[PDB]
Design a protein around this ligand. Structure first.
Ligand SMILES: CC(=O)N[C@H]1/C(=N/OC(=O)Nc2ccccc2)O[C@H](CO)[C@@H](O)[C@@H]1O
Length: 333
């Protein structure tokens, strides 16, 4: 596995896709809604991806629940992460949500969901009800349960967006938001806790500048990714970059330079989404490096959707998640 996560255009692989996936710089494919038509098509696509790579390759997706669920039709709907804490039995429900989400992905030959969100609060429009709560303890109580669910079925976990994206409430009018708070201790406490617990296999940093701490976005900052994340907090897992196709070239250079800089800053792996031309430029021009420790993120269990549906745990979780959505969704009222 190499450092690069890239994506494909549609429901099946093109000839170019099959060629690219063999490249040693590729480590993973991130799937989007545009790669999902139906359950059988998804299984076929994932088989094809793994066959084309001719070595282990990660298949990942943003499948959080609520506003962020790429595969919906023919899957169980998972609620916004916010909903668990709104119910009296929120800890049990959060575990069910994590388990169900992860299990259905595993059953369709996906390695991992980029989850959970450990951001604090609902006031950042991009985050909102993706957060488990608005205070440290509510977020920890419910995210920990969600994590336990994911781990129960052998899915690797990813905390995001380190050191916390919950309070980005102003618009910088630039490509990189700023969070101007003099202290983000509460936000970081959540990440510290989950790292110490040993329950995060990976971390995605925030593309956010925290000027009272450091001048660079966390996702491109040695301060955040090395000094804090590694040395102070003792994180031993995989660090993913921000989506590099998002970064402008006027300051950061072209996609090859941006990839290099992310890796030097402390990322293990880099993401280039929705920009095939950039991904190919990086494959064509980035010196080859291996990320063997990424193999830790490969899913640990194998089962089919038929098998999953025969489990009481599935029958209950699916019913309970639909009911939880119905309890708090404005759409269902
Ligand atoms: C803060 C946030 O929602 N980041 C998401 C995220 N955000 O990506 C962008 O914001 N990309 C972008 C934004 C503006 C212009 C071009 C790309 O991408 C990752 C992969 O899909 C997700 O795992 C992250 O959760």
């Amino acid at each position: 596995m190499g450092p690069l996560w890239l994506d494909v255009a549609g429901y099946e692989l093109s000839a170019e896709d099959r060629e690219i996936l063999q490249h040693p710089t590729v480590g993973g494919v991130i799937l989007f809604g545009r790669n999902y038509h139906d359950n059988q098509q998804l299984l076929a696509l994932n088989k094809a991806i793994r066959q084309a790579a001719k070595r282990p390759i990660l298949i990942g997706v943003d499948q959080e629940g609520g506003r962020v669920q790429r595969f919906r039709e023919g899957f169980s709907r998972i609620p916004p992460a916010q909903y668990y804490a709104r119910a009296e039995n929120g800890v049990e429900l959060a575990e069910q949500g994590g388990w169900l989400m992860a299990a259905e992905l595993i059953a369709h030959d996906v390695d991992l969901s980029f989850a959970p969100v450990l951001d604090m609060g609902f006031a950042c429009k991009a985050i909102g009800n993706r957060a488990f709560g608005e205070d440290v303890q509510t977020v920890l109580k419910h995210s920990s349960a969600f994590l336990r669910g994911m781990k129960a079925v052998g899915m690797a976990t990813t905390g995001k967006h380190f050191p916390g994206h919950g309070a980005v409430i102003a618009d910088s009018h630039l490509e990189t938001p700023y969070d101007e708070r003099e202290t983000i201790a509460q936000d970081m406490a959540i990440f510290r806790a989950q790292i110490e617990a040993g329950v995060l296999d990976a971390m995605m940093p925030a593309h956010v500048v925290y000027p009272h701490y450091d001048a660079q976005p966390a996702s491109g900052s040695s301060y955040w990714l090395k000094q804090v994340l590694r040395e102070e907090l003792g994180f031993k897992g995989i660090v993913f970059s921000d989506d590099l196709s998002m970064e402008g070239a006027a300051v950061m250079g072209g996609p090859v330079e941006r990839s290099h800089q992310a890796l030097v800053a402390g990322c293990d792996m880099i993401l280039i989404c929705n920009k095939r031309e950039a991904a190919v430029e990086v494959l064509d021009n980035l010196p080859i490096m291996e990320v063997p420790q990424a193999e830790a993120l490969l899913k640990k269990q194998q089962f089919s959707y038929s098998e999953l549906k025969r489990l009481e745990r599935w029958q209950q979780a699916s019913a309970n998640m639909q009911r939880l959505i119905e309890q708090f969704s404005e759409h269902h009222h």
